[PDB]
Structure 1
Amino acid sequence: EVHHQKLVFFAEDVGSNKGAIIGLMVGGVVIA
């Protein structure tokens, strides 16, 4: 038996990437 109960409540841009500059590389090759 497992219960659960949530009341999550976020107000402003929680966890957002607003205006960010994001560069990812997971593997691959770049010969610049």
Structure 2
Amino acid sequence: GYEVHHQKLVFFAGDVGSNKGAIIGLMVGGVV
């Protein structure tokens, strides 16, 4: 018997005002 529930994975749980930059989850190299 296996009971698995209610897992979650959020990257950004909130509110942003005036995002002029970068919100990136996974980057390899590159220039921001």
TM-score range, shorter chain: under 0.3
Structure 2 spans left out of the alignment, 5+ residues: none
Question: In proportion to residue count, which structure has more strand?
Answer: 2
Larger RCO: 1 or 2 (CA < 8 Å, sep 6+): 2
With the length of structure 2 as denominator, give the TM-score of the two structures: 0.24
Which structure: larger Rg? 1
- Report which stretch shifted further, 21-30 or 3-12: 3-12
Instruction: State the 4+ residue runs in structure 1 displaced beyond 2 angstroms.
Output: 1-22
Q: Alpha carbon RMSD of aligned pairs, Å?
A: 7.8
Structure 1 spans left out of the alignment, 5+ residues: none
Taking every aligned residue pair, what percent have the same amino acid on both sides? 97
